[PDB]
Every structure is written in structure tokens, then in C-alpha cells.
């Protein structure tokens, strides 16, 4: 049988491919992750059918407990696979069963360049420069969880204000950094992949944590081994290097 | 229960306490990885019993395909989980079920400072530094085994003259290092932890691939989603950066 793989809409992960006329299944996407599974089908034999998240969420819970997003689309059954930037969380963990890492990161920050800013201390220590992470994303939920003192700090700034210094999705945050005095609290890989495009942005500081993006499956999926022993082989080979430079690579920042 | 726990003796991972009488059982040891088992132990509610691998190996396969060291501890199920530097490779993989990472490295050089070698790519094209890896381990491993022009080219000088420019541990390449006109490959938190210590060496370049050390448990264990579980939880609580701190920190250069 087919593998329904789930899978959302994230620069340069999975884009629609530009096209004159429309695009139908597969052949409406390309990007990092689009690579992935074709070296993935490669390796293991299977065919995928790619289907975007109907919520278009990656997956947390609501006040209830219930999931959502990619993470409930494979904990119901609805996908086999989910290949997507989606980071391995201590919390979603626990709900599917993650393959190991096909890409290593950790949160960061996105600022202007020229500015004395130099770590997250130095943002945790006033209130001029606003800062905040998107809602209900694993960064947001790293800062919530912290017991880390300027991480309380920060989060305790974050929430503040019913959490206006929050953004609902990466290019709202990126906007705010372009426009006001706003930093954004965002993965390593995405700023990598910003501040390759735009030389006016940086990354402020190292990596606050350290984490991984993997591929989902259900609990207890045959693949998730299979797939696990596959990225570590496409890693070993330097493919996914490979992978990450094609897909990275802008037109050039100092 | 009690777990059985296979180990090896690797400084800062797993060494010998001191003491002025003979010490015994568990209190023989210290280290990041005792460390490790103790806050895994306290998450997970497990006893534990750890014994040195009596062949001394991590695991690695002979000419007839038999593996050795602490990966075969595990596929014969003499120990319940292998705790050490043990990196995530393709090869172990297919044959032990391992945790998800609570370290992330890479390959990269230890050298001395002061010359004008800044790259793999630049011991690759030459013949007069010798250069080299720990043989048998994963770094040899990954050499042999790469179709990377640059990587054949550095196994085919690592491996010719039967081999001479191996070494059998990296306290025998550390001290080729500080004598002669050598550079080691080594595993970049190894690197990390001697030049905290050394302080006429250095990296060479960056890390030339990405990859894991995580606890080994036998195909099929129960403890290893249970491990990276906790692990996960370890790492957003910022308690793995604080043992690798307590453990890499050295008294400072000059
Ligand atoms: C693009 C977003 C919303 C995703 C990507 N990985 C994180 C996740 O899987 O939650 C989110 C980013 C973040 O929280 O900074
Ligand atoms: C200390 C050594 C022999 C071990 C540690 N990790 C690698 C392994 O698990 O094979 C080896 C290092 C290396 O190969 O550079
Ligand atoms: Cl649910
Ligand atoms: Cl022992
Ligand atoms: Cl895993
Ligand atoms: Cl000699
Ligand atoms: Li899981
Ligand atoms: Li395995």
C-alpha cells in the first residue's frame, strides 16, 4: 500500500512548485522535504501520497488534551508518515513514535544587524527591544516550560500583554524584525535560511537548546526503525549535507 | 528492576573515582555518563548495576561479520542498556535499538595550532602530515565506508602502509599529536574536552558530518523509548548542558 505522508506548507521544506497551469498530487510540491522522501522511497521501497495538513498546524494540544495537526493526523491514523520540519519535542514524544533526526538546530534569535544585542541575556534584561516567538509552536513552549531564570524572564515578558508580542507564523515575526524593534525567537535552520536573503537580519547569539527534526509515525509504526536506519545511511553518505546546501544556498549575506 | 549496564572506561565519560582505599561496585566510577544514568534513574525509577565491557570494544564487525564490545552485550542481552560515548551508526542500528541522542557531534581534526592547515580538504591533498583515526571505531568507519573524492582519498593514505597511521585509542593519538607532525580525527566533544586540557591544540576546520551518541538497548527493549523520553526531558530542562559543562569545563589557556 501507499504511505499517506502529511506534511505542511514551510519554506524551503515544502513549497508549491511554480508552474503555468495547475498542479495536481505529488507533482504540486518540492523543497527539502520533497528530496527527503524521494531518497526515503529510495531506500525502503514504498510509495508516498503527500496531503497537507487539513488544519495546517504542527501539533500541540488544546485545553482539553486532544491534539492537533500533523501530530494528530498520524496519533488517528489519518497519515503514515509525517515529513516536515517538525521539531522532537519531549511532549509529542510521548503521542507518535519520532524517527531519529534528519536535521540538527536549536532555538535562536533573529535581529538587525549593527546593534550591541548579543545574547538572550541582554534581551531578558530590558523592555525597549520587544521579542517573541510564533504561538504554540515548540519555541514558544520551550520558554513557557523553562525554570531557567532568564528564561522565566523572558517568558513572563512574552506572555505579557494577552501575548502581543507573539506572531501567528514565521513571516508575520520576520515582517515585525524587518519594520519595528522586535527580535524574534525562531530555529537556527530558519534564521540560517533568512539571513542568506535578506542582509539586513542576523542571528544574535548561539543556540539557546539543542533539538532535532524527525520524521513522524504512529506509536508502534513498522517504518519508523526502517526510516531511522535510512537517514542515519543518508547522513553517513553526506546526502542530506548535500540536501541541505541545494536547498539553503541565497544570493549571498556577509 | 535492576539494570544491567554495560560501560567503558573514556575520560570525562565514565572513569575512575579516587579514593585512598579499593572502591567497589558502582562507586568505582564517575562521570558524565554516572551522571547521566543517575538522572535517568530518577526520572524512570530504576536500580542499576554498572559493568565494565570485558573485551573493552564499543562494537564494531570482524572480517566474518561477528560484532564485539558493548553492541554485543546487548544482542546476546547480557546487559539491559549500553551508557558510553557510543555513536548512532547505520551499521549498529540494524542491530541494537538505540535511544535517541543525548549528545550530537561530528568528525572534525585535532591538530596543534599554529599552522596553515584549516581543512580536512587541505591533509587530503598532501602526504607529508600524516594523519589519522582511532582503528576500528566509527571515525575509521565512516572513512572507509564514504564515496566522498576527499574522504577516499584521506582512506586510502589512513589505511596504506598496513595502516600505520592509525592509532588504537585517542590517548595514543593525542600524544602522536603533541610529538610529531600528525592530526587525529577525532569525534568533536573529544576534541572539545582536549583542548580544554592541551593548550598548544586545537580543532581543525568544522565538523565534517552530524551525528549522535545515545544509550544502547537490545533490539526490542521496553527502556528504549522509555530513554529518550527522559533524555528529551533532560535536554529541555537544560540538565544536559549542565553535565557537559561540569565535566568539559578545564582550567582555562593562556
Ligand atoms: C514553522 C513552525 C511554526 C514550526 C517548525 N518547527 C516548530 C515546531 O515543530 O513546533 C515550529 C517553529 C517554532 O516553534 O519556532
Ligand atoms: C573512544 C572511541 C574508540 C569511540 C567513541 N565513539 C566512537 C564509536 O562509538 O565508535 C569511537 C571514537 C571514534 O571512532 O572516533
Ligand atoms: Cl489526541
Ligand atoms: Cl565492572
Ligand atoms: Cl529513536
Ligand atoms: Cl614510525
Ligand atoms: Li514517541
Ligand atoms: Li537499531
Same mark, same amino acid.
Given at each position: ?21 495547475? %498542479? ?12 527527503? %522522501?524521494? /531518497? ?12 497537507? *495538513? ?22 488517528? #491514523? ?20 519520532? &524517527? ?7 532555538? &535562536? ?16 534584561? $530590558? ?32 506572555? &505579557?500583554?494577552?501575548? !502581543?508580542?507573539?506572531?501567528?507564523? &514565521? ?13 524574534? %525567537? ?5 534564521? /540560517? ?5 535578506? +542582509?539586513?537580519?542576523? $542571528? ?10 524527525? *520524521?513522524?509515525?504512529?506509536?508502534? !509504526? ?12 543518508? $547522513?553517513?553518505?553526506?546526502?542530506? #549535507?548535500?540536501?541541505? /546546501? ?6 549571498? +549575506?556577509?
Amino acid at each position: 500500500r501507499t504511505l499517506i505522508v502529511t506534511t505542511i506548507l514551510e519554506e524551503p521544506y515544502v513549497m508549491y512548485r511554480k508552474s503555468d497551469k495547475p %498542479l495536481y498530487g505529488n507533482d504540486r510540491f518540492e523543497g527539502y522535504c520533497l528530496d527527503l %522522501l524521494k /531518497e526515503l522511497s529510495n531506500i525502503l521501497g514504498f510509495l508516498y501520497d503527500v496531503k497537507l *495538513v487539513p488544519d495546517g498546524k504542527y501539533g500541540a494540544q488544546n485545553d482539553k488534551g486532544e491534539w492537533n495537526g500533523m501530530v494528530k493526523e498520524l496519533i488517528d #491514523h489519518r497519515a503514515d508518515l509525517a515529513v516536515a520540519p517538525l521539531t522532537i519535542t519531549y511532549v509529542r514524544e510521548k503521542v507518535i513514535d519520532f &524517527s531519529k533526526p534528519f536535521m540538527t538546530l536549536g532555538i &535562536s534569535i533573529l535581529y538587525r544587524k549593527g546593534t550591541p544585542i548579543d545574547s538572550a541575556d541582554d534581551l531578558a534584561k $530590558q523592555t525597549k527591544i520587544e521579542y517573541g516567538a510564533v504561538r504554540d509552536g515548540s519555541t514558544m513552549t520551550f520558554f513557557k516550560k523553562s525554570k531557567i531564570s532568564t528564561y522565566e524572564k523572558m517568558w513572563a515578558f512574552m506572555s &505579557s500583554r494577552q501575548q !502581543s508580542a507573539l506572531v501567528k507564523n &514565521s513571516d508575520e515575526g520576520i515582517q515585525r524584525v524587518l519594520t519595528t524593534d522586535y527580535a524574534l %525567537l525562531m530555529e537556527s535552520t530558519s534564521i /540560517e535560511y533568512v539571513t542568506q536573503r535578506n +542582509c539586513n537580519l542576523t $542571528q544574535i547569539g548561539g543556540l539557546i537548546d539543542s533539538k532535532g527534526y524527525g *520524521v513522524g509515525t504512529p506509536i508502534g !509504526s513498522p517504518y519508523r526503525d526502517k526510516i531511522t536506519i535510512a537517514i542515519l545511511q543518508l $547522513q553517513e553518505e553526506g546526502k542530506l #549535507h548535500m540536501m541541505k /546546501e541545494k536547498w539553503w544556498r541565497g544570493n549571498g +549575506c556577509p
